[PDB]
Design a protein around this ligand. Structure first.
Ligand SMILES: OC[C@@H]1C[C@H](O)[C@@H](O)[C@@H](O[C@H]2[C@H](O)[C@@H](O)[C@@H](O[C@H]3[C@H](O)[C@@H](O)[C@@H](F)O[C@@H]3CO)O[C@@H]2CO)O1
Ligand SMILES: OC[C@@H]1C[C@H](O)[C@@H](O)[C@@H](O[C@H]2[C@H](O)[C@@H](O)[C@@H](O[C@H]3[C@H](O)[C@@H](O)[C@@H](F)O[C@@H]3CO)O[C@@H]2CO)O1
Ligand SMILES: *[C@@H]1O[C@H](CO)[C@@H](O[C@H]2O[C@H](CO)[C@@H](O[C@H]3O[C@H](CO)C[C@H](O)[C@H]3O)[C@H](O)[C@H]2O)[C@H](O)[C@H]1O
Ligand SMILES: OC[C@@H]1C[C@H](O)[C@@H](O)[C@@H](O[C@H]2[C@H](O)[C@@H](O)[C@@H](O)O[C@@H]2CO)O1
Ligand SMILES: [Ca+2]
Ligand SMILES: [Ca+2]
Length: 686
């Protein structure tokens, strides 16, 4: 199959995701609607169920609404059974219409549908070349009160109907009892409750095993990807182990929700996207886009800096899920704003690197403030809006033009208000011009591109006041006027002669697992795949075609490897780096070191005899470790993904910058569990 196929669960870069708030999209089966105080068929009361369900999505898939727009993937509300309680918050009734208050990760939310309905949804979507991503929120269950078990459902966790336990009388320690977070530190936000949400204890073997088994159920149902809720709120090491469970079973494109505020650039966030085994929702991109096109708090230079910085910061920038708004922020379009702002932001997003996600109703100019105002029922299914047409014209380019899906990004022309950028991949090019100034045109002269000589019609057809481009030899464009609020797209596509890797997924797994290498120019005959210096050819290459290769990871030692391919003729491709070969199946283990004193700015890290611990390389050590919540300084702790059942030697380090202080004495040793979790507690050796 080609890279663009709906069957490709490892790569969404050629797709356009449509984020559906299930309850607010389409009620295709009124018979499953909740009732009484929990329901509002008119959807006036935005905190109650409105009736939107899976049957509704199926209908919209079948009637051309989504397909006509060029949408090729949907991200739906968490499908698992949520609490049925109607919570009264300061005199206001609240329900689980949003799907984020889970009670049983092994059952469906009856309001959305039955398991059968889910299967039908998967089937209907696939039939229309639409991939299905489910939201998944393993950070917590639901609202709870320890000293008020009568409140809500006490955050009770069920296993396919079987009660595991609740927040109250949590003798099992299924949950964290560390209070609530103020978001003051990453550690604080991980080990304390988000609001009043019962925080699941990922260090508890039952919880750990249960969650991994639960996801497996969904994978078996045929999902194509996962949107992980609150990834900044769960132990990173645990999440890595979770991603390993997924990848070592049935890998699917996974992206996490890690909020970034205006102007926030987080190295920790970069590291997570780079080493967790999952990518992230691109808040950096979204926030910058809002500043530039919506709020006027930054200009094109800021947009350019975000593009350049992000491309360097994220090992796989093409895996970051971009967006302009979502259910947790005010809608992009302000009721009184010029619609062109929204249209441009959309055009920008659709033609930029990563994986674009469109919040349902954006195309209908929905406006709305903070939750729940940003979750109204979609008011229309009109294909006639300018925004709908913008998506319709641009979304498909992700499939037809690999420069858009996998290309580099280069600024070609810029000023406060104008940005002209170029996407390039193989013999494919796309040039996008955006003039955010709604009142002033710009005179574009000196524009140089990689486009072949000739005249280029705006892909947008002048929809956003774009114009035709005239390119001479050398790629120089003739002078032109970029209209006020103008947005234009010019492209060129052709067969690529040389093997070129545009994407690899998953990026982390154990030997034997099949990975997908996508791109162009691979040729039709089986070639060679390289993992670092190791060559793979023949049988282990399951399938090979011009745009896609399926190959089993060789039994190399755990570590980080650069991927490269060569066609049957021996011509090598570019290198796709950062591939992580795991040492085997993973388990989440908590490491605790006592009496490790440090000076301000100096932190404790973990190192050891397996690639998962950085193979004794301080530059690859695990940390910095925590020392506030679960354990207190001078004691430090950290949850780490390690190879199951392996005997591992390790030591702790004290690092300040790249300066390292090693624990004295001999290495510590332990044998990782075969399944579930474990806690290894030792003392710092001077
Ligand atoms: O190839 C010649 C030229 C030499 C420069 O050192 C190099 O940067 C590159 O120049 C590009 C700029 O990088 C582009 O930004 C653009 O310049 C535009 C400005 O962006 C715009 O503000 C206005 F000053 O017009 C400039 C063009 O005259 O194009 C130039 C190349 O023309 O390459
Ligand atoms: O270079 C290969 C080396 C051979 C050893 O037999 C094997 O154990 C492994 O060595 C590890 C040590 O086991 C680690 O303890 C650590 O050594 C640290 C010391 O712990 C520390 O006290 C300080 F002397 O620095 C040493 C590192 O420079 O790392 C080595 C690998 O470098 O691998
Ligand atoms: C990631 O997960 C969170 C947590 O579930 C989602 O938010 C949902 O849960 C929130 C808390 O229950 C809901 O918000 C309520 O509580 C906040 C706290 O003050 C204020 C709101 O007014 C309440 O509705 C929220 O509505 C849910 O969506 C995120 O949406 C998800 O991305
Ligand atoms: O709690 C995190 C904090 C971050 C610092 O960078 C790290 O040094 C350490 O801080 C220690 C100091 O090193 C120690 O001297 C003493 O001041 O306690 C703090 C921890 O509260 O941890
Ligand atoms: Ca319904
Ligand atoms: Ca948590």
């Amino acid at each position: 199959a080609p890279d663009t196929s709906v069957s490709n669960k490892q790569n969404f870069s050629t797709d356009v995701i449509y984020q559906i708030f299930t309850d607010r999209f389409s009620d295709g089966n009124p018979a499953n609607n909740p009732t009484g105080a929990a329901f509002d068929g008119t959807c006036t009361n935005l905190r109650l169920y409105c009736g939107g369900d899976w049957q509704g999505i199926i209908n919209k898939i079948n009637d051309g609404y989504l397909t006509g727009m060029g949408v090729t993937a949907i991200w739906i509300s968490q499908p698992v059974e949520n609490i049925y309680s109607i919570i009264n918050y300061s005199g206001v009734n609240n329900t689980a219409y949003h799907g984020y208050w889970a009670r049983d990760f092994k059952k469906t939310n009856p309001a959305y549908g039955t398991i059968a309905d889910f299967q039908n949804l998967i089937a209907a979507a696939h039939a229309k070349n639409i991939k299905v991503i489910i939201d998944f929120a393993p950070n917590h269950t639901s609202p709870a009160s320890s000293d008020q078990p009568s409140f809500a459902e006490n955050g009770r966790l069920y296993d396919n109907g079987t009660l595991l336990g609740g927040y109250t009388n949590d003798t099992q320690n299924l949950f964290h009892h560390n209070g609530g977070t103020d978001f003051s530190t990453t550690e604080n936000g991980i080990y304390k409750n988000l609001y009043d949400l019962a925080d699941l204890n990922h260090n508890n073997s039952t919880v750990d095993v249960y969650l991994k088994d639960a996801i497996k159920m969904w994978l078996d149902l045929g999902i194509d990807g996962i949107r992980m809720d609150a990834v900044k709120h769960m132990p990173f090491g645990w999440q890595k182990s979770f991603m390993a469970a997924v990848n070592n079973y049935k890998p699917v494109f996974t992206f996490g929700q890690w909020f970034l505020g205006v102007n926030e650039v987080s190295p920790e966030n970069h590291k997570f996207a780079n080493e967790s085994g999952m990518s992230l929702l691109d808040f950096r991109f979204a926030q910058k886009v809002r500043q530039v096109f919506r709020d006027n708090t930054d200009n094109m230079y800021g947009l350019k800096a975000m593009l350049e910085g992000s491309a360097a910061d994220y090992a796989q920038v093409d895996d970051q899920v971009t967006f302009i708004d979502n259910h947790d922020m005010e809608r992009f379009h302000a009721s009184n704003a010029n619609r062109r702002k929204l249209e441009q932001a959309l055009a920008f997003t659709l033609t930029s690197r990563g994986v674009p996600a469109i919040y349902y109703g954006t195309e209908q100019y929905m406006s709305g403030g903070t939750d729940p105002d940003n979750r109204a029922r979609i008011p229309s299914f009109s294909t006639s809006t300018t925004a709908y047409q913008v998506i319709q014209k641009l979304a498909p380019l992700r499939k037809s033009n690999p420069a858009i899906a996998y290309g580099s990004t280069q600024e070609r022309w810029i000023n406060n208000d104008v940005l002209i950028y170029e996407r390039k991949f193989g013999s494919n090019v796309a040039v996008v011009a955006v003039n955010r100034n709604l009142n002033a045109p710009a005179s574009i002269s000196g524009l140089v591109t990689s486009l072949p000589q000739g005249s280029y019609n705006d892909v947008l057809g002048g929809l956003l006041n774009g114009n035709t481009l005239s390119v001479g030899s050398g790629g120089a464009a003739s002078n032109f006027t970029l209209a006020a609020g103008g947005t234009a797209v010019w492209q060129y596509t052709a067969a690529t002669a040389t093997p070129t890797i545009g994407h690899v997924g998953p990026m982390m797994a154990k030997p034997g697992v099949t990975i997908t290498i996508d791109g162009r120019g691979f040729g039709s005959s089986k070639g060679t795949v390289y993992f670092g210096t190791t060559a793979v050819s023949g049988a282990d290459i399951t399938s090979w075609e011009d745009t896609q290769i399926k190959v089993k990871i060789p039994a190399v030692a755990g570590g980080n490897y650069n991927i490269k391919v060569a066609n049957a003729a021996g011509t090598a491709s570019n290198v796709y780096d950062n591939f992580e070969v795991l040492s085997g199946d993973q388990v989440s283990v908590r490491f605790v070191v006592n009496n490790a004193t440090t000076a301000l700015g100096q932190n404790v890290y973990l190192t050891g005899s397996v690639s998962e611990l950085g193979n004794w390389d301080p530059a690859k050590a695990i940390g910095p470790m925590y020392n506030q919540v679960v354990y207190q300084y001078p004691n430090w702790y950290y949850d780490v993904s390690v190879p199951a059942g392996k005997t591992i030697e390790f030591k702790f380090l004290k690092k300040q910058g790249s300066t390292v202080t090693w624990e004295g004495g001999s290495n510590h040793t332990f044998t990782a569990p075969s399944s579930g979790t474990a806690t290894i507690n030792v003392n710092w050796q001077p």
